[PDB]
Write a protein that binds this ligand. Structure first.
Ligand code: 3PE
Ligand code: NDP
Ligand code: ZMP
Ligand code: ZN
Lengths: 88, 499, 115, 337, 154, 117
């Protein structure tokens, strides 16, 4: 199940610490392998920094971009949160 | 100069990938000398000679005015009549997806790449190349996890290193003050070094295991692999020359497979045995924000509008003959002399630009002087042309762009520090899963630095480096070799320095 | 002691915000009352409407101050600037230095050099 | 307007904008700058850090100009019109040459034809000889080679000579000028100007001299103004009677004039000009202009083509006429009637 | 709107062609901060310009460390107007009135408090600290059971 | 730049003697030089030509002392080693010294910096 045609990159901003729940790291731990295998041509930039509220960006064609926070979401709720971003 | 008449600016060296901390001494318009300043995590009170003695190339072949190529000649242009001439060409060419191409050089800062990524993205291009050979195609290591392309054990990690393997890099000509740290650890401890690639005259002792991937495969399967296995704090260092090679696809999977096989040694609670060494200041920061060709589909689309963002060591095959070339930079060199329009930008001693060094340390320069002539700041040039091309970029100030920067990667807002890679083990995907079937050619590793004194536009324009190269060619130990002073064969001296 | 001059006002602190409120109105009134008298003292060739416009704008820049001790410094400066003007200690060049008779966009600023 | 100016010969000028300490990069020569207009163009060029050559004749009358610019900025050269070398020495380092040399009345060594035609000839021939970028020559309003007034004819022939030698000439035709030290408002407030041939009923569109110096500054920066012809006139038409009405309302004096029949006054005026050494305001041709009326020749650029909107003379009467109010009415506000 | 250049900021007698566009200026409504820059008399350019707060590093050329003791506040060089060459003598002209000035503070907090109260933009860099390591003269002469890795020369 | 008094860098030397010295022809040009007497301008002699007309002070000692000869009027007293077969120069005043042990070698060179005699 690859992405929808139009997503040009994914960008997750999380933190190493448990200050925010480990769910984004738990989802990325599992998702990033399969979510990169099904469509290798798209960059899924995993970027982290201390005290970063979890968050994901999808950049679409002609420079447009969608952001959604991942704060308080669970590893499943975060999954549909990304899912609506790359399904159309 | 005298020291009391010198202004002191604490900046960062951009002449290699280490980000050595420097003190820039200026007397008004002119930089006078470059001094080291203390950073035990980075440079340890030392800078190399090119970092030190190439500052005299900041005043010699500079770009101060926009030039438009007319009838095979470069004529001066007003900034308005240069951006209009650029906009007209882009409108005429009507570049579709990925026929706009951008190549970024060694000295570009992150405020430019993040600004250029936003300009090309809204023009429909994801074709964002790099100046090295193989910089216009997808890279063997990706950019999804930062640990793919960093010096993951810190520069400070060499202080503990027990076994170090070198893969295709001359640590003297790539990171000269990092090469010294290896020697320091070697003299005072039982550190064992072996290398794969071209032999080099070294300040430390090492074992030459070979020159190509077959040799490296025996290297890990043999005694040095067991030495790498048995050691605490083992350290494999991949040079950026490997990433330039035909078999970077195959080299990078071979190394990481050894690492993943050997965690709890390589991937512990506090250690990262995997390192990639960068020799240019712009390249880790380019990786930090995705300024890299994503797919061979993008790389196979021939461009008709090429922006050379400080690019001067570009391969001649990465620039079409019939493309409209725009060169942005601060020196008149190989990049400027083939372009249709040149735009004068800032140098690193006159900008406040972010740079990320080979280990992922985020550092900022401080402007020592103002802009020469009619030069502009580079991210303002990119923002200015986004007006003319029809897609203005939201930010109008450096803070607004540094807010943009911090939501591409939030580490870019944490200065002077290195962020830890949380999901370290996710490096397997782009390093091994994505690099499995590679048409290995067996071509040996190359020596990517032919001349240490000439590596970029500033060095190639320095009179002092010109004397360093010429004396090194003939061995003249004389102090006034191509400098003012009386000699036995020069009774009357000379005013010329560098000739 | 020596006599305080004609418009010399003793420096006193505002008791409360009501005090400050009434003083600021007194100062604004006293300025705009004097604009006809400023014009002929300093031979201003503009009409008095422009002079009173400038008085209004000077008061408007301190509109959003919610600190008694900042207002009282400000009420001090206007008292000295009023006394200085009415006694004709400053001259026409100073009063005309007060009447000015930055790029409006990034792109306008970029093209001319910074501004 | 920008930080880069490129000239007709193609040299670039990288400028630093503000103040008298900065770099305007332009080397100008302003012939006829010790008159009335000449200071406003020189102050404008000098206070923005441009080198200005000021060819002068009398040493003590040039001195107010040096204050305009920084050290080494305003260079004085002593010249004569009939000294070609001093003309050539004065324009050969320059990228713009302003020709503001004119005289209303003939002199014992210069006729109106000699100061206008021949003076322009030498100045333009040196502009051609050393290849100076820009040449803004200032003619007069109503200039016409077919005119019969010596002033409007001779300044109309110099216009054609300049173009024939240097076609890129910016020809500038101002209307009668008002300002500080103007020979318009200060004469109507004076007491010597009592004689007159018409009933002060000739009309013209008076223009502020301050806005004409600004206009000449903008022609240097708007390169496209080269080879053009500019008439620089004011927003309204007035007679000498309407202007003199404003002056009386301002100074509170109610000046009076003695009218003479032109066949009588003109011969006398030619005698006063020939027998007195100072500018008397009276001469045979100045009487002839007195009976003539201003026509704004179309197909000529205007202030709007510089993006400028001139102000009316009425707004300026208080500023410039106040020195002439009697003590009783001096403390009064501007008339603004 | 997220640190924006405000192009409607009023200009005063001290604004030149080298004055930066300001993101914001003090007006005296701000919480807990004395608006000194509003009442100081300094131009608005002082609130459009960022200062650097740091401890100067030791010069490479000397071992004395007295100029490293305190915190220094400087004004950043702007792209235009910092220096240009006078046409007459070649002296170096300037339009930056803060180029020859600096303030000195005892602690980092004092520097922040002063810049906050004056309305400056301000960036802090932290000093790089020396990594301690015992040094022993007797290391010069340690026994080597095997190959001498270098020949010491004193 | 018509006369030689507006081109020659010094009366005794035509060319520049420093890397950064602006040539006289490039500094006597411009509007500020259009009604100027060139020979009335300050045009001092080049010290680089003058010092090199001094003859070598020959000595047998290894180390020579130079204080400028003026006593307190001269310069700070220093010491010049004369061991290299080369003319040793005082860093303050430029006076040339040689050691007699190189007299035969120096009187063999095709050219030199100072008159050997
Ligand atoms: C004493 C020696 C003789 C004085 C000079 C006489 C020579 C002479 O030329 O006199 C004629 C003189 C010309 O005056 P001019 O300047 O040419 O007229 C323009 C002013 N509207 O006109 C005059 O008469 C000047 C008055 C004396
Ligand atoms: N002012 C007006 O109402 C109008 C003016 N004009 C034209 O505008 C220009 C400037 O006007 P304005 O400044 O008021 O005029 P002025 O008469 O005040 O100035 C004329 C200038 O010409 C110089 N000059 C005159 N005759 C000679 C000569 N024979 N040789 C050398 N220099 C000479 C004068 O130098 P010096 O002082 O040394 O004698 C003076 O600097 C003139 O050409 C004028 O004719 C046209 C229409 C209206
Ligand atoms: P309403 O309830 O709206 O009351 C309006 C006021 C202004 C009182 C405010 O609500 C208010 O309380 N705000 C705080 C007080 C304030 O606005 N400022 C303090 C007063 S001092 C001041 O503003 C001085 C201004 C500059 C000096 C006076 C102006 C004249 C300068 C010279 C004129 C020309 C000379 C040549
Ligand atoms: Zn001596």
């Amino acid at each position: 199940y690859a992405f929808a045609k139009g997503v040009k990159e994914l960008r997750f901003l999380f933190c190493q610490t448990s200050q925010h729940s480990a769910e984004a790291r738990s989802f990325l731990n599992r998702a990033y392998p399969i979510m990169k295998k099904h469509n290798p041509t798209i960059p899924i930039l995993l970027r982290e920094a201390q005290g970063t509220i979890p968050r994901v960006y999808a950049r679409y064609e002609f420079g447009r971009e969608k952001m959604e926070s991942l704060e308080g979401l669970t590893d499943k709720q975060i999954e549909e949160t990304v899912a609506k971003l790359v399904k159309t | 100069a005298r020291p009391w008449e010198l202004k002191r600016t604490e900046s960062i060296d951009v002449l290699d990938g280490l980000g050595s901390n420097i003190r820039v001494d200026s007397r008004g318009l002119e930089v006078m000398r470059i001094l080291p300043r203390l950073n035990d995590d980075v440079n340890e009170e030392w800078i190399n000679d090119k970092t030190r003695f190439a500052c005299d190339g900041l005043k010699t072949q500079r770009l101060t005015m926009p030039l438009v190529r007319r009838d095979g000649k470069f004529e001066p242009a007003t900034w308005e009549q240069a951006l209009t001439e650029i906009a007209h060409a882009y409108q005429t060419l009507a570049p579709k997806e990925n026929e706009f191409k951008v190549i970024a050089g060694q000295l570009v800062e992150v405020e430019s790449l993040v600004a250029m990524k936003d300009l090309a993205n809204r023009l429909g291009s994801e074709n964002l190349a790099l100046d090295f050979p193989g910089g216009s195609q997808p890279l063997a290591h990706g950019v999804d996890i930062r640990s793919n392309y960093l010096f993951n054990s810190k520069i400070w990690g060499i202080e503990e290193a027990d076994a170090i393997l070198l893969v295709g890099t001359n640590p003297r000509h790539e990171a000269a003050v990092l090469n010294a740290r290896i020697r320091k650890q070697w003299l005072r401890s039982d550190l064992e070094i072996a290398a794969v690639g071209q032999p080099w005259e070294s300040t430390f002792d090492y074992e030459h295991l070979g020159t190509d991937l077959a040799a490296l495969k025996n290297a890990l399967s043999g005694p040095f692999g067991e030495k790498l296995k048995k050691a605490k704090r083992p350290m494999i260092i991949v040079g950026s020359g490997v990433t330039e090679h035909p078999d970077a696809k195959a080299f990078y999977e071979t190394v990481w497979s050894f690492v993943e096989k050997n965690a709890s040694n390589f991937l512990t609670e506090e250690w990262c045995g995997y390192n990639v060494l960068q020799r240019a200041a712009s390249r880790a920061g380019a990786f930090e924000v995705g300024f890299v060709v994503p797919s061979p589909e993008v790389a196979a689309t021939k461009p008709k509008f090429v922006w050379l963002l400080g690019a001067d060591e570009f391969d001649p095959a990465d620039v079409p003959k019939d493309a409209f070339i725009v060169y942005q930079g601060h020196h008149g060199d190989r990049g400027a002399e083939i372009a249709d329009i040149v735009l004068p930008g800032a140098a690193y001693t006159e900008k406040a630009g972010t740079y990320v060094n080979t280990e992922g340390r985020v550092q900022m320069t401080r402007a020592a002087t103002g802009l020469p002539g009619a030069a502009r700041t580079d991210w303002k040039i990119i923002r200015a042309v986004s007006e003319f091309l029809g897609v203005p970029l939201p930010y109008d100030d450096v803070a607004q762009l540094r807010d943009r920067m911090a939501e591409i990667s939030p580490a870019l807002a944490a200065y002077d520090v290195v962020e830890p890679v949380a999901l370290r083990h996710l490096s397997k995907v782009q390093l091994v899963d994505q690099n499995k079937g590679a048409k290995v050619t067996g071509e040996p590793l190359k020596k990517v630095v032919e001349n240490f004194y000439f590596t970029d536009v500033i060095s190639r324009s320095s009179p002092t480096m010109a004397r360093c190269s010429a004396a090194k060619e003939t061995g003249d130990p004389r102090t006034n070799f191509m400098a003012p002073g009386m000699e036995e064969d020069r009774p009357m001296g000379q005013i010329a320095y560098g000739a | 002691a020596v006599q305080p001059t004609k418009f010399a006002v003793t420096v006193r602190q505002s008791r409360n915000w009501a005090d400050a409120k009434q003083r600021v109105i007194a100062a604004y009134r006293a300025w705009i009352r004097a604009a006809p008298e400023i014009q002929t003292m300093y031979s201003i060739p503009f009409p008095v409407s422009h002079i009173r416009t400038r008085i209004r704008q000077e008061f408007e820049r301190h509109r959003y101050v919610n600190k008694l001790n900042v207002v009282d410094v400000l009420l001090q400066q206007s008292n000295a600037d009023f006394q200085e003007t009415m006694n004709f200690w400053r001259q026409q060049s100073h009063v005309m230095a007060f009447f000015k008779e930055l790029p409006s966009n990034f792109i306008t600023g970029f093209l001319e050099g910074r501004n | 307007i920008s930080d880069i100016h490129i000239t007709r010969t193609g040299k670039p000028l990288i400028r630093i904008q503000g103040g008298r300490s900065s770099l305007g990069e332009h080397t100008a020569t302003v012939f006829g700058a010790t008159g009335q207009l000449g200071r406003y163009i020189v102050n404008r060029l000098a206070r923005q850090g441009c080198t200005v050559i000021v060819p002068y004749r009398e040493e003590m009358a040039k001195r107010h100009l040096k204050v305009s610019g920084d050290l080494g900025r305003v260079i004085f050269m002593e010249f004569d019109l009939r000294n070609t070398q001093s003309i050539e020495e004065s324009v050969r380092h320059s990228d713009v040459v302003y020709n503001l040399i004119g005289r209303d009345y003939p002199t014992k060594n210069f006729s109106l034809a000699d100061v206008h035609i021949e003076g322009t000839e030498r100045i333009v021939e040196a502009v051609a000889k050393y290849d100076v970028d820009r040449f803004i020559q200032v003619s007069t309003y109503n200039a016409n080679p077919d005119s019969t007034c010596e002033f409007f004819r001779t300044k109309g022939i110099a216009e054609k000579v300049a173009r024939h030698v240097f076609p890129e000439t910016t020809i500038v035709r101002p209307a009668p000028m008002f300002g500080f030290e103007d020979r318009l408002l200060l004469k109507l407030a004076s007491v010597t100007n009592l004689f007159t041939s018409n009933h002060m009923r000739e009309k013209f569109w008076p223009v502020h001299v301050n806005e004409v110096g600004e206009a000449l500054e903008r022609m240097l920066y708007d390169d496209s103004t080269a080879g053009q012809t500019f008439e620089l006139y004011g927003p309204r038409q007035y007679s000498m009677a309407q202007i003199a009405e404003l002056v009386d309302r301002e100074i509170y004096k109610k000046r009076r004039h003695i009218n003479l029949p032109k066949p009588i006054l003109q011969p006398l005026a030619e005698l006063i000009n020939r027998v007195l050494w100072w500018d008397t305001g009276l001469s045979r041709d100045q009487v002839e202009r007195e009976f003539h009326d201003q026509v704004i020749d179309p197909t000529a650029k205007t202030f709007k083509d510089l993006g400028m909107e001139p102000t009316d003379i009425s707004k300026w009467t208080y500023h410039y006429l106040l020195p002439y109010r009697p003590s009783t009415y001096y403390d009064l506000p501007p008339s603004t009637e | 709107p997220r640190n924006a250049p405000d192009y409607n900021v009023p200009i005063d007698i001290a604004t030149s062609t080298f004055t930066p566009v300001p993101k914001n200026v003090q007006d005296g409504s701000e919480e807990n901060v004395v608006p000194a820059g509003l009442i100081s008399g300094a131009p608005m350019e002082l609130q459009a310009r960022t200062v650097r707060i740091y401890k100067p590093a030791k010069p490479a050329t000397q071992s004395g460390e007295k100029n490293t003791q305190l915190w220094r506040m400087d004004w950043d060089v702007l792209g235009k107007g910092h220096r240009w060459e006078n046409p007459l003598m070649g002296w170096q002209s300037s339009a930056d009135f803060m180029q020859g000035t600096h303030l000195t503070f005892k602690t980092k907090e004092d520097a922040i408090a002063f810049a906050e109260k004056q309305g400056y933009e301000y960036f802090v860099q932290e000093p790089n600290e020396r990594h301690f390591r015992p040094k022993a003269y007797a290391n010069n002469f340690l026994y080597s059971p095997g190959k001498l890795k270098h020949i010491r020369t004193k | 730049g018509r006369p030689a008094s507006a081109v020659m860098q010094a009366p005794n030397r035509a060319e520049v003697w420093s890397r950064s010295q602006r040539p006289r022809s490039e500094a006597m040009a411009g509007p500020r030089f259009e009604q100027t007497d060139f020979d009335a301008q300050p045009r001092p002699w080049a010290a680089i030509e003058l010092i090199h007309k001094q003859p070598v002070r020959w000595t047998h000692d290894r180390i020579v002392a130079c204080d400028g000869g003026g006593g307190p009027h001269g310069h700070p007293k220093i010491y010049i080693n004369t061991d290299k077969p080369e003319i040793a120069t005082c860093n303050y005043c430029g006076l040339p010294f040689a050691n007699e042990h190189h007299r035969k070698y120096l009187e063999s060179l095709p050219q030199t910096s100072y008159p050997l005699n």
